[PDB]
Every structure is written in structure tokens, then in C-alpha cells.
């Protein structure tokens, strides 16, 4: 749980929330997926700014699954680790 | 390779670079780890702003390893998926 390890989620210009994707038939059973708080971003003044968007960050992760106990399966899944703020101007 | 899938790395206010952590004795053999481009962040005007820091985003991932071919090991490793911009003010 990074809600206990890293507090970046709350201090980001692109802050996010955590969602428990629970499942007993897969390992890790519980996964913390990040959903962006806003469309816009937190600027300097501390307002939501719609000249940039908070966007999620995906990552492919290996997982084990089981039938329902005699069968197991290694599979790759896509999980959203956090949010970053994208801009049109570079 | 997200250098081929997602181009956020280059459009982030907290842009990052990719590093190939290659290893034949582990699966996935090659891993793309994100190193932040700057300490500060890209503001509206498009300058690096030192009133906020670009910070990496860690995530624990399962991996397989092998001896050097008769032994294997499932282990959890910490990898940096990308960068977000943290601020003192909330």
C-alpha cells in the first residue's frame, strides 16, 4: 500500500486516488490502481488549470491466476500506477 | 516499449528518459526504467520551474530469474514507471 508508503498522490500537480481492485483467484489478490482527481492540473496559485491534463500512467505487470486449486496461469495485465500532467506546448 | 506505445514521457511537465535495464538471467529480460529529465518542472511559459520537483514513480513487479537452467525464482522488484511533479503548496 503506497497510501501508507508514498504520499505523492496527494502532492502531485496531477493528484490521484487509489482503487482497490480485489480478486481472490489472482496473485497479487488486491491491487491499488490510480484514478486521476481532475481533468486539469494544479498550477502555482493552487487552482485547477485546464491548459494541461492530468493523465494516468499504465505499466504491464505479471500475475498468477487459479482455477476455481489444480491449475495456475501466468498472465500479463495493464495497471495504472499514477498520474502525470501533459501539455500541448513543449 | 512505450517509447513506441505512449509518448507521454516527452509531453509531461515532469518529462523523463528511458533506460534499458537488460538481463538475460531474468524474465522480462529487458525493462524500460524512467529517469526524470530535470529537477524542476516545465511551467506554462515552457521554462524549467524550481518551485516544484519532477519525481520518479516506483511500482513493485513480479519477475522470474534462473540459475546460471535447472532452477527458477519468483521475486518482487521495484521499478520506476515515470515522473510526476510534486509541489509544496496544496
Amino acid at each position: 500500500n503506497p497510501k501508507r508508503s508514498s504520499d505523492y498522490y496527494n502532492r502531485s500537480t496531477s493528484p490521484w486516488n487509489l482503487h482497490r481492485n480485489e480478486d481472490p483467484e489472482r496473485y497479487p489478490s488486491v491491487i491499488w490502481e490510480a484514478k486521476c482527481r481532475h481533468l486539469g492540473c494544479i498550477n502555482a496559485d493552487g487552482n485547477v488549470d485546464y491548459h494541461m491534463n492530468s493523465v494516468p500512467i499504465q505499466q504491464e505487470i505479471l500475475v498468477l491466476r487459479r482455477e476455481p486449486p489444480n491449475s495456475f496461469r501466468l498472465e500479463k495485465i495493464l495497471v495504472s500506477v499514477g498520474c502525470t500532467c501533459v501539455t500541448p506546448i513543449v | 516499449n512505450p517509447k513506441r506505445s505512449s509518448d507521454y514521457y516527452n509531453r509531461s511537465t515532469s518529462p523523463w528518459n528511458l533506460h534499458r535495464n537488460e538481463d538475460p538471467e531474468r524474465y522480462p529480460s529487458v525493462i524500460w526504467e524512467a529517469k526524470c529529465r530535470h529537477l524542476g518542472c516545465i511551467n506554462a511559459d515552457g521554462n524549467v520551474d524550481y518551485h516544484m520537483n519532477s519525481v520518479p514513480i516506483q511500482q513493485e513487479i513480479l519477475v522470474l530469474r534462473r540459475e546460471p537452467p535447472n532452477s527458477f525464482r519468483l521475486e518482487k522488484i521495484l521499478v520506476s514507471v515515470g515522473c510526476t511533479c510534486v509541489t509544496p503548496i496544496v
Epitope: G40, H51, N53, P88 | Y8
Partner: antibody, heavy 118, light 111 residues
Framework: EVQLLESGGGLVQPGGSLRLSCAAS????????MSWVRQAPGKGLEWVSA????????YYADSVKGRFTISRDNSKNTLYLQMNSLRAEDTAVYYC???????????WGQGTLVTVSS | NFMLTQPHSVSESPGKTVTISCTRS????????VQWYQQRPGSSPTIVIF?????PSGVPDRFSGSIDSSSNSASLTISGLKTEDEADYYC?????????FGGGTKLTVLG
């Protein structure tokens, strides 16, 4: 070079249903907001719908809310538009656009003509 | 939903300067990016200006976007007119849930 190719256009009866497709190339499709814009024959441009890069954010013009449904297949580099309960007012050329952020539209498609008639 | 109002038609002789005004009602124009599009007879729209004043590939210094919130209006300008600039110009902006297009302005080159 960025290319947006619509398809699906056709003649449909009112109350009808139709599926526009837009095959994208020249960019990292998975990391871009997409838009569908229309233009009624002889009228101007009119925003229809929007979808985030992830597909977890979905936006709709009042007129098409509850009838049209935007979706994407980031795996196949294609953006879809499922039109149901098509009214005559939905006759137009639907163009497909790539948006930098939500709102800032950067590239446009060739367009596809949808005719809703009895 | 709010609205953008731009003049129906615009005229001028060549080599001159034309301003196409786009005036958004509810919401502050300063908070959201304005874009401009050109539409030639029979052709599909094309990006002219984006993020209030940026020009892409194939857009000369002749075209140039600008903004002014103390009246709440963004303005695309064309310095040094060419007969070949005759087309429909649309402004476009947004808000957290909607995207809005102008009614368009039909440019005309006298002479």
C-alpha cells in the same frame, strides 16, 4: 506523417444505428485524446464527442448524449463511434480528430458522410 | 456549453491585414486554449493556429493568433493577404465537459 481514416458512413433510416471507424497512424495513438466532429451539409462544424487516451474519460454534445457512444481500441490504433436512434438532424460529414489535451484539436480526418433519410 | 460568436463575413484588398474576432460568452477565455481552422471550398478543415497563437507545419508568419480577456475574445490575424487565403475560418475552444465551435467567418479578397 499523422493520418486519420474514417469509414462506416451510409444511408440509414431514422431510428437507425451505425458504426463509424477511424484508423489512426503516424502517432502513439494510446496516448492521445480523440474527437468526432460533424458538419451538416451547408452548415458549419459542430463538436460531437470526445474520448481520453485511456478511454476512461468520455465527453458528449447535448444533442447526442444517451444515443451516441464513443470508444477506442488502443491495441488496434482505431477510434469508434456507435450511433443509435439516428435522427435526420444527424445528417452530416463526421470527421475524426486527434487532440493534444482535451479541447486542443491538432489533426483532422478526411470525413465520412452519414445520411439519415426515410 | 457556452458560445463563440465570430462575424459572418470579412473582406480586404491584397497585401493588407485582416482580423477575425471570436467572442466567447460564459467562462473566462484566459482559462482555455483557442484554435483556428481554415476550410477551403469542398475541402476538409485544417489547423491554422492552436494554444491561442501557435502555427504548425505549412503555416507562414502571415497567419497569427492572439487573445484579450478584458473583452473575452481571441483574434486570428492575416498580415499580407493573398487571394489564395479565401476560405471559411472557424475558431474553437472548450471547458471541463464541452468543446465549442464558432459559426465561422467567410473571408473575401477584393480587387
Amino acid at each position: 506523417e499523422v493520418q486519420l481514416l474514417e469509414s462506416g458512413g451510409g444511408l440509414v433510416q431514422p431510428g437507425g444505428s451505425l458504426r463509424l471507424s477511424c484508423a489512426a497512424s503516424g502517432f502513439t495513438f494510446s496516448s492521445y485524446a480523440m474527437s468526432w466532429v460533424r458538419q451538416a451539409p451547408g452548415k458549419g462544424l459542430e463538436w460531437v464527442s470526445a474520448i481520453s487516451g485511456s478511454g476512461g474519460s468520455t465527453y458528449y454534445a447535448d444533442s447526442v448524449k444517451g444515443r451516441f457512444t464513443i470508444s477506442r481500441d488502443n491495441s488496434k490504433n482505431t477510434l469508434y463511434l456507435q450511433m443509435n436512434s439516428l435522427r435526420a438532424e444527424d445528417t452530416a460529414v463526421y470527421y475524426c480528430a486527434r487532440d493534444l489535451i482535451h479541447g486542443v484539436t491538432r489533426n483532422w480526418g478526411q470525413g465520412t458522410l452519414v445520411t439519415v433519410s426515410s | 456549453n457556452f458560445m463563440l460568436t465570430q462575424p459572418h463575413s470579412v473582406s480586404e484588398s491584397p497585401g493588407k491585414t485582416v482580423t477575425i474576432s471570436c467572442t466567447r460568452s460564459s467562462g473566462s477565455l484566459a482559462n482555455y486554449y483557442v484554435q483556428w481552422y481554415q476550410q477551403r471550398p469542398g475541402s476538409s478543415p485544417t489547423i491554422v493556429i492552436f494554444a491561442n497563437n501557435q502555427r504548425p507545419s505549412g503555416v507562414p508568419d502571415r497567419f497569427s493568433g492572439s487573445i484579450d480577456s478584458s473583452s473575452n475574445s481571441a483574434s486570428l490575424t492575416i498580415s499580407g493577404l493573398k487571394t489564395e487565403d479565401e476560405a471559411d475560418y472557424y475558431c474553437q475552444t472548450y471547458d471541463p465537459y464541452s468543446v465549442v465551435f464558432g459559426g465561422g467567418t467567410k473571408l473575401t479578397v477584393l480587387g
